[PDB]
Amino acid sequence: TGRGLSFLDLIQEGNQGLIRAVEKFEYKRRFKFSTYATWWIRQAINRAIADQARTIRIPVHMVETINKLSRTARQLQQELGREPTYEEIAEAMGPGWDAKRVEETLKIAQEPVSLETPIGDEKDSFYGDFIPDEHLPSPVDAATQSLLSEELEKALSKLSEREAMVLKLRKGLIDGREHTLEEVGAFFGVTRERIRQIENKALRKLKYHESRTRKLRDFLD
Amino acid sequence: MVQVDGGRFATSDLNDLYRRLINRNNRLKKLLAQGAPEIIIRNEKRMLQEAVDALLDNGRRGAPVTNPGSDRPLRSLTDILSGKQGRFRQNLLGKRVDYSGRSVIVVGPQLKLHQCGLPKRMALELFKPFLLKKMEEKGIAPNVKAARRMLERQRDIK
């Protein structure tokens, strides 16, 4: 108990162990049953503890490496009178192990923490109540993308609809994907050199309009 | 399952509850396939009931589930819905709200009855999109985003 899993969870894993042991037991060896069963029972409980007790699941060999590293540091501290540094542990752990590896193995072992863990005596305070949401865009962000889309349209309209269309294809502001020169030229019925060239002149006219009006600089961040 | 600033993970208690459920359901399916005795399947069935109980209303019947190393019951679906902090009276009869502020009250006897004294600072943030719009109207800034940049820092404010 006290190792990640409920007593009853532990008993049902020991019961899966008992099942393997019944189906694998050879009375002919003259051994009592308990002796052989205890092995498969211990085996089953340890595989469950290593397989479920972590919210973020970590392969069996890795859990064993983490636990070895635990016990090493505990020996090191019980002889040093103090906690060990990463370097002392990378020594007592053996070759192949440098301080950096101790560090990263710990950072991997870091269990998640509850969003409902309170901060205050009152129940008014959770830990989730301080975590923003960095995925859904802010209204500032969305509005800025809207003003960008509109100003890009405003400066694209000063181009002829052919060069505006060549650029809206070669970058993908329409349909979401950018095209090759052969596709823009087999759509416009023009050579890839010619469609690349009217892309050149479209970009150059847009650069001139931008040196003049300066309406798009503020969106370059 | 959110990575907070420090890189460490926050998570919800509904995750540990569901995980308990899937583990007891999977172990049950496997003790059935392997033909396990009665007593054992009875115990797995009971424990599975109690896992579904805890997910839906933890602590309602018998013990409350907890995460290891804590005496603190886990937040079940019922505790989310019901309660002074439950969703109903926490986010649907009252919400936190944008465009608000708060400060210390002082007596203003020179105000008319329909008036209040509101500091410049609270007023510049509480009216901030308007402030960008009218900052663009007059020459103070080229566009909305340049105005927001200009108000970002205090010393830039004119």
Partner: peptide, 14 residues
């Protein structure tokens, strides 16, 4: 009422 006491009883049957 206490699942592990109940299961200890069912086990002490056999």
């Amino acid at each position: 009422s206490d699942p592990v006491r109940q299961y200890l009883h069912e086990i002490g049957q056999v």
